[PDB]
Coordinates of C-alpha atoms in Angstrom, one line a residue:
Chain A
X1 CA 114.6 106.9 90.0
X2 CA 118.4 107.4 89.5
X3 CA 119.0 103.9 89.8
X4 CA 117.4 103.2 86.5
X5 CA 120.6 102.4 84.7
X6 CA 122.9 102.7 88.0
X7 CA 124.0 99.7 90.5
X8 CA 124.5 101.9 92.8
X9 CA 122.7 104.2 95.4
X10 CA 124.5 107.6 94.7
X11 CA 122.1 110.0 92.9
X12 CA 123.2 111.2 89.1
X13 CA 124.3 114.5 88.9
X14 CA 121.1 116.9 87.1
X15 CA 120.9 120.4 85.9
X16 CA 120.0 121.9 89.5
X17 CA 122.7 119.3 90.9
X18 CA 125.3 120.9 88.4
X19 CA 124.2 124.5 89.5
X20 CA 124.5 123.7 92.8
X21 CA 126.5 121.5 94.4
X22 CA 123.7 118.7 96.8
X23 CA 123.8 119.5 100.7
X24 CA 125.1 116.9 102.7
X25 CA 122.8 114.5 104.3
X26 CA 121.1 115.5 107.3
X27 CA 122.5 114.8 110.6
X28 CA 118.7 113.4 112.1
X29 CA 91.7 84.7 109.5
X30 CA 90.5 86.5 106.3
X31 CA 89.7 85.3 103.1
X32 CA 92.1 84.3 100.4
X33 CA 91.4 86.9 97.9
X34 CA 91.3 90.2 99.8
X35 CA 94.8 89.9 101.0
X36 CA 97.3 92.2 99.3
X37 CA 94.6 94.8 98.7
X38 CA 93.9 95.0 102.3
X39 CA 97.2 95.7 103.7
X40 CA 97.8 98.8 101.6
X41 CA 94.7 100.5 103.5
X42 CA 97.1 100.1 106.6
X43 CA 99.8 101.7 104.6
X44 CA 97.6 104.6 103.4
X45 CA 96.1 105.0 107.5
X46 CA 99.8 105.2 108.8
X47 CA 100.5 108.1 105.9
X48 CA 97.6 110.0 107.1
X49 CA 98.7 109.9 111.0
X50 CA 101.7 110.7 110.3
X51 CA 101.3 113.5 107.7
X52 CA 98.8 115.1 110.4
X53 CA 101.5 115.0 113.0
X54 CA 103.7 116.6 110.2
X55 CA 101.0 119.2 109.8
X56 CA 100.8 119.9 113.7
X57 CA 103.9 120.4 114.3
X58 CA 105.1 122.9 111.6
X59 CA 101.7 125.1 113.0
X60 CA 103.3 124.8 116.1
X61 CA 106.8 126.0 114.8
X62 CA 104.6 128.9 113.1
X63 CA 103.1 129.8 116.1
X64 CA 106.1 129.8 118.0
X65 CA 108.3 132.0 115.9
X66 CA 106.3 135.0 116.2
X67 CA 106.8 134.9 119.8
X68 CA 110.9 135.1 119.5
X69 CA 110.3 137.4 116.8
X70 CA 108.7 140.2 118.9
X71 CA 111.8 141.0 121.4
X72 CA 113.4 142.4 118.2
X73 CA 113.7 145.7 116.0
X74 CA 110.9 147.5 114.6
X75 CA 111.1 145.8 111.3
X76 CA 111.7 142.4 112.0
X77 CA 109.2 142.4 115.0
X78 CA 106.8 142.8 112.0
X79 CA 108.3 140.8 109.4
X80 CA 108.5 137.7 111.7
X81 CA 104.8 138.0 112.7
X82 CA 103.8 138.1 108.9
X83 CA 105.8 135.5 107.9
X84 CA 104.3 133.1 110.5
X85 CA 101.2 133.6 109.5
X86 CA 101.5 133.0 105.8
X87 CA 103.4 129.9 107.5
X88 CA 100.5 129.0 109.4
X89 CA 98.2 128.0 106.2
X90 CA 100.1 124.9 104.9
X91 CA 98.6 123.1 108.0
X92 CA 95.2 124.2 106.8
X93 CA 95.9 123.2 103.2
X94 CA 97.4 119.6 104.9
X95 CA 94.2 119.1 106.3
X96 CA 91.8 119.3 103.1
X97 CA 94.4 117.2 101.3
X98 CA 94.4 115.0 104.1
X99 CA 90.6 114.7 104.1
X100 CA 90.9 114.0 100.1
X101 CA 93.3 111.0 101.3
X102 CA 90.8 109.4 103.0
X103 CA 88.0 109.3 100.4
X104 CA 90.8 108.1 98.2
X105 CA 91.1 105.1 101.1
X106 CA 87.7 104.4 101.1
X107 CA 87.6 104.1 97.4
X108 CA 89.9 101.3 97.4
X109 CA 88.5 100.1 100.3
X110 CA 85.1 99.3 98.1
X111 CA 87.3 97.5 96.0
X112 CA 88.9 95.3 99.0
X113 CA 85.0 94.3 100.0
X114 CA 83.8 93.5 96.6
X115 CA 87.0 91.0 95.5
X116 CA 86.5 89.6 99.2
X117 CA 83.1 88.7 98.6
X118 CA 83.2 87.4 95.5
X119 CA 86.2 84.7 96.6
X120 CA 83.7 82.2 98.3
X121 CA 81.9 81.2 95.0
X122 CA 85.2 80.5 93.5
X123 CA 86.3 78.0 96.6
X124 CA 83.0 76.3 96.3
X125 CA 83.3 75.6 92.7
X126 CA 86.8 73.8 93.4
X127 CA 85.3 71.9 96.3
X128 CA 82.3 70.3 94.0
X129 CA 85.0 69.1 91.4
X130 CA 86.9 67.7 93.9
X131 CA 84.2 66.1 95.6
X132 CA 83.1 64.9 92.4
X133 CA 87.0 63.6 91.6
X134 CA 86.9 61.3 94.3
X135 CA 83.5 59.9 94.1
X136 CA 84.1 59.0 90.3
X137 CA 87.9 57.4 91.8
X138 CA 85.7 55.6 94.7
X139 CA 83.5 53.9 92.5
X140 CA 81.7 55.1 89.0
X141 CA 78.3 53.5 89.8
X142 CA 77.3 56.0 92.5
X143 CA 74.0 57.7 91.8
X144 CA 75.6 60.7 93.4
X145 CA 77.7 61.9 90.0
X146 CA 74.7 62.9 88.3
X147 CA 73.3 65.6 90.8
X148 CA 77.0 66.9 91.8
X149 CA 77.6 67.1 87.8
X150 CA 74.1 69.0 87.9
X151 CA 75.0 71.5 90.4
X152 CA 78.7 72.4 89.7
X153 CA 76.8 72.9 85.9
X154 CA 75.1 75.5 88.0
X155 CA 78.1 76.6 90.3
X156 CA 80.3 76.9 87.1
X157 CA 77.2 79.3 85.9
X158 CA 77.3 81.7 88.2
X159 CA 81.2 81.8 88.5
X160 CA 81.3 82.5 85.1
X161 CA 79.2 85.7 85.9
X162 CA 80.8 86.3 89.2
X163 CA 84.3 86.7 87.8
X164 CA 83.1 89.3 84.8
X165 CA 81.0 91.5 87.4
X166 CA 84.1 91.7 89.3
X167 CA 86.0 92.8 86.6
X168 CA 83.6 94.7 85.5
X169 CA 84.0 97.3 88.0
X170 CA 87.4 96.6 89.6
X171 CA 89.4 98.9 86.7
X172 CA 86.1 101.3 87.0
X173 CA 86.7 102.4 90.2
X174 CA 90.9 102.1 90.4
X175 CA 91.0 104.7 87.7
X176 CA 88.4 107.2 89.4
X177 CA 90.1 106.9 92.6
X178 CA 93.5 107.7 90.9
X179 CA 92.1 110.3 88.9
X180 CA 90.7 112.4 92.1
X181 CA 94.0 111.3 94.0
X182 CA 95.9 113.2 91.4
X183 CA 93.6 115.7 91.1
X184 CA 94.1 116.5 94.8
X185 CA 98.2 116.1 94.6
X186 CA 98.2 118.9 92.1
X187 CA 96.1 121.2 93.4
X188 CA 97.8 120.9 96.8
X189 CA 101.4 121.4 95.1
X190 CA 100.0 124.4 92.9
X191 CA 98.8 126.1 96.5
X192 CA 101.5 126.0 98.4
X193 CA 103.9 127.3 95.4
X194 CA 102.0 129.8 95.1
X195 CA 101.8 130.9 98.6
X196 CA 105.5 130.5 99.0
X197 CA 105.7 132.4 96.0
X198 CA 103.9 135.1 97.3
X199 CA 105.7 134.9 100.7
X200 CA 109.2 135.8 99.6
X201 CA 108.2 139.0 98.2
X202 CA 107.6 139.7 102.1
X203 CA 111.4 139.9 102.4
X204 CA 112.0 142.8 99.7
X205 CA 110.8 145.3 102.0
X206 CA 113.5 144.2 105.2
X207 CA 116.5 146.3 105.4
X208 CA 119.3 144.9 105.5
X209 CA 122.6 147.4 104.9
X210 CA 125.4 147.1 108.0
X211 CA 125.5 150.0 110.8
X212 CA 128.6 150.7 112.2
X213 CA 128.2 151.2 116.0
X214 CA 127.1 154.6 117.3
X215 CA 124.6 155.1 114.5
X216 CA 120.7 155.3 114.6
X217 CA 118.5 153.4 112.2
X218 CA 116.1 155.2 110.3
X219 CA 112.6 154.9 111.1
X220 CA 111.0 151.6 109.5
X221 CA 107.4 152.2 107.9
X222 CA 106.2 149.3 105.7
X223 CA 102.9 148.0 107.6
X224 CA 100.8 149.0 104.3
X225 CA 103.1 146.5 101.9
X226 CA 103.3 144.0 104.7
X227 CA 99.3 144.4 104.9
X228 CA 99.1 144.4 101.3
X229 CA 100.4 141.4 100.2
X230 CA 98.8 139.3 102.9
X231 CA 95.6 140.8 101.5
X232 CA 96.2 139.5 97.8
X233 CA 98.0 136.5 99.1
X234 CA 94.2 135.9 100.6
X235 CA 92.7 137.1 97.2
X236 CA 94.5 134.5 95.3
X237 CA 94.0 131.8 97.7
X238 CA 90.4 132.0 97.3
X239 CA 90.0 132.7 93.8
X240 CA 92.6 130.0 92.4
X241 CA 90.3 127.1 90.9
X242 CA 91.3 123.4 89.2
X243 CA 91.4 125.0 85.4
X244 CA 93.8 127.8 86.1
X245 CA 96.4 125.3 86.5
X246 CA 99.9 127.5 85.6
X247 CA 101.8 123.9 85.6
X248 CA 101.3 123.0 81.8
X249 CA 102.6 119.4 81.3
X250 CA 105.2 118.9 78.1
Chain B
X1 CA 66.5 67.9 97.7
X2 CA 69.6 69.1 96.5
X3 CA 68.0 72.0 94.5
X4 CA 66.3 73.5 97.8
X5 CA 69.7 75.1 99.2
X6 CA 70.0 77.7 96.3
X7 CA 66.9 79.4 96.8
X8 CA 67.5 79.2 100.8
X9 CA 70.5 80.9 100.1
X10 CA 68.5 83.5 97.8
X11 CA 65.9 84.3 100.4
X12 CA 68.4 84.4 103.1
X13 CA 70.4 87.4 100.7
X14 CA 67.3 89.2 100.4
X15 CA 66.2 89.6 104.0
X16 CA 69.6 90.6 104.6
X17 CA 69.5 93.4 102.5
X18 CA 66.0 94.3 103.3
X19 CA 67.1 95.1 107.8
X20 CA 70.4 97.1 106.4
X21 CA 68.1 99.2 104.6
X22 CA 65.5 99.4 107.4
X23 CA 68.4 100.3 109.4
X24 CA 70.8 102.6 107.5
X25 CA 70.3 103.4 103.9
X26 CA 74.4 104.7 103.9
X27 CA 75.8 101.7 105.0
X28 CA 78.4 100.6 102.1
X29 CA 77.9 96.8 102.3
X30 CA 74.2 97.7 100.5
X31 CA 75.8 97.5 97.3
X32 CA 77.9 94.5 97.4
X33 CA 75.0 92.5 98.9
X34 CA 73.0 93.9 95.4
X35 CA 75.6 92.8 93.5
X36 CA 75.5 89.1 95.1
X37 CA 71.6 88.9 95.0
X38 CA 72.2 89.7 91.0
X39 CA 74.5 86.8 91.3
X40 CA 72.1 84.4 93.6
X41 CA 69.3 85.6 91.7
X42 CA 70.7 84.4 88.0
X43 CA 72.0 80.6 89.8
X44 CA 68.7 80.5 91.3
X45 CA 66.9 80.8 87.7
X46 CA 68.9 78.5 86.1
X47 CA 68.5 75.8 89.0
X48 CA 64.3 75.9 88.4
X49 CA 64.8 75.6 84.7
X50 CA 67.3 72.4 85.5
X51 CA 64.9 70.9 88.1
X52 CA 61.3 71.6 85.9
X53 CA 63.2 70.3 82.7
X54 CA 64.2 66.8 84.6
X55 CA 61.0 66.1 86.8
X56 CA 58.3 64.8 84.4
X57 CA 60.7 63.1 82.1
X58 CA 62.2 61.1 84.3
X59 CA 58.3 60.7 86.2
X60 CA 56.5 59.7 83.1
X61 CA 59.5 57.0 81.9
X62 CA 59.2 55.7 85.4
X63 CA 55.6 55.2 85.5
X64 CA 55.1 53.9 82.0
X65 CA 58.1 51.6 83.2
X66 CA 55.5 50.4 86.1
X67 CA 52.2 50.1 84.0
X68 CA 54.1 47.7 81.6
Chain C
X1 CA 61.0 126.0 120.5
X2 CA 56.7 125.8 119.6
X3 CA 58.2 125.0 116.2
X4 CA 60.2 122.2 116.4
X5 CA 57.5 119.4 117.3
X6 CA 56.1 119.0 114.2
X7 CA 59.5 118.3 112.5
X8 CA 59.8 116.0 115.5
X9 CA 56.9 114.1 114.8
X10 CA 57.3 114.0 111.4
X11 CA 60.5 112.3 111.3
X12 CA 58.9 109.6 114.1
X13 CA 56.4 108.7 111.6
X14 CA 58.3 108.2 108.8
X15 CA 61.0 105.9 111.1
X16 CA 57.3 104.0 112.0
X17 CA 56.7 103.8 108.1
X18 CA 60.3 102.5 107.4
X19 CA 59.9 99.5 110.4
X20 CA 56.4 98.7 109.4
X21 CA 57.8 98.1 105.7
X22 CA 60.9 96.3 106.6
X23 CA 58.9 93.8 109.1
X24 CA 55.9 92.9 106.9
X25 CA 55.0 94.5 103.7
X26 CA 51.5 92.9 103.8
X27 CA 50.5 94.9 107.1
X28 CA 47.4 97.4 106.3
X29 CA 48.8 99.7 108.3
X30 CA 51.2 101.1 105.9
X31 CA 48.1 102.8 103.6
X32 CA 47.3 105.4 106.8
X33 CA 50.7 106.0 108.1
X34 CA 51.4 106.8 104.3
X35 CA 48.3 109.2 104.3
X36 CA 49.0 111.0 108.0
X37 CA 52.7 111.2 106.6
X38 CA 51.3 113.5 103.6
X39 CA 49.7 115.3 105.9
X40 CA 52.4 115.9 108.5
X41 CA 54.2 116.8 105.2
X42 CA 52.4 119.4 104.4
X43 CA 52.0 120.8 108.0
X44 CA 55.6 121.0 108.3
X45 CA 56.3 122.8 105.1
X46 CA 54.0 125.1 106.0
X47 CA 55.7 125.5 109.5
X48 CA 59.5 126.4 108.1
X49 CA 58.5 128.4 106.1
X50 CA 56.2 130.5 109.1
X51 CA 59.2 130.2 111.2
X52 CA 61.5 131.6 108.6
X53 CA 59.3 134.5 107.6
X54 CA 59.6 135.7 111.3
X55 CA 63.2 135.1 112.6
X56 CA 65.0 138.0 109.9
X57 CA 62.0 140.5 110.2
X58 CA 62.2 140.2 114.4
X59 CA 66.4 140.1 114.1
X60 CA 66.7 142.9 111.9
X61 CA 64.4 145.1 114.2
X62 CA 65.6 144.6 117.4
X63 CA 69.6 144.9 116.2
X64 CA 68.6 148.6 114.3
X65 CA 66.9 149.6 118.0
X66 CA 69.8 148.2 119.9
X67 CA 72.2 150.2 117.6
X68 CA 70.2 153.5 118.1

């Protein structure tokens, strides 16, 4: 972020910056172990409501331009109704991604489980050699050393495989779960370029040379290339796949 | 008597798994209750070994300690 | 509606065969539940297939006479 090698909060000037100048800002108990990990799932629950809420609301914004746009001239009566809905599919595309989010939670929920299990052998081990501390401070002639020395021998065993199961899987499953989570991300950004890609060619068939008053408009006919590229729009939606990526990282 | 616990413990693990799989095979907690019994199952094989290994030696010094 | 029984029934015995094995693995019951289950198996594969042999041929019919 732009505050790599800044003290500041002011965003360095780029390429696009440079092009054009920036707008102005806009005007609007549990165990021990399984702590940190489990409060992110809260995070990543929050995200989802509220990028649903996001999603409902710009279908309703969709759905309630066309019905302003229809009290208007031939062309734009048209245009407007096209336009909202190539609009309304970015709510359909939030959904799936949002669906994808979730197994993405529930990976890292497995994760939460497993560590949170696996804490209790861990405490137990600590409370034998404690125990076993203070009965050796107490007095060293107790016949009780020689069994507790017996079973944290035992305890320590099966620690010493808890931790390396745990381990085991823990970077198995984080990268999976990361992989498919950016998997998702990209597939998501590649559709919706494309279909705003695809969307502002809608707005090369709108007329837009001034009339002076007292003067007819010609008669608009453009409902085949208005039809048209919905239809491909639609082709292209359904035939893009995961290896025709056109993003080609450097 | 101290021994007994661990293989309490390991029967207790196994029943538990047994009803959630009577129950619902697609519950999740299936797999980190496998991964335990592994655990369980390895403590519980060494504690046998320990107990067998300490029985009769300490029984026959104890006995010849009593004929003599 | 005659059809779906069978895959009701099925399904009830192999819930029965599920609980009988999670309770008691000993019982002798689990030998004839596993033999009626075969046969209920086969039953029902039979019956799909019956059912779906029928549904497109009487579909298909009636729409082209509706149509006409």
């Amino acid at each position: 972020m732009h505050r790599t090698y800044s003290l500041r909060n002011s965003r360095a000037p780029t390429a696009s910056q440079l092009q054009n100048p920036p707008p102005p800002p806009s005007t609007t108990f549990g165990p021990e172990l399984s702590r940190k990990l489990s409060q992110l799932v809260k995070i990543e629950k929050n995200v989802l409501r509220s990028m649903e809420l996001t999603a409902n609301e710009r279908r309703d914004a969709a759905k309630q331009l066309s019905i302003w746009g229809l009290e208007n001239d031939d062309d734009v009566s048209d245009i407007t109704d096209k336009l909202g809905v190539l609009i309304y599919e970015v709510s359909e595309l939030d959904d799936q991604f949002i669906d994808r989010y979730d197994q993405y939670r529930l990976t890292l929920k497995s994760i939460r489980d497993i560590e949170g299990s696996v804490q209790p052998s861990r405490d137990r081990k600590d409370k034998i050699t404690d125990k076993i501390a203070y009965l050796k401070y107490k007095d060293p002639q107790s016949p009780k050393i020689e069994v507790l020395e017996q079973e944290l021998v035992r305890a320590e065993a099966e620690s010493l495989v808890a931790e390396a199961q745990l381990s085991n899987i823990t970077r198995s499953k984080l990268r999976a779960a990361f992989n498919y989570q950016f998997d998702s991300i990209i597939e998501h950004s590649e559709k919706i370029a494309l279909i705003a890609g695809y969307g502002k060619a809608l707005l090369e068939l709108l007329d837009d040379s001034p009339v002076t008053p007292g003067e007819t408009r010609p008669a608009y006919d453009g409902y085949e290339a208005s039809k048209q590229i919905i239809i491909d729009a639609e082709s292209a939606l359904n035939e893009w796949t995961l290896d025709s990526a056109q993003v080609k990282p450097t």
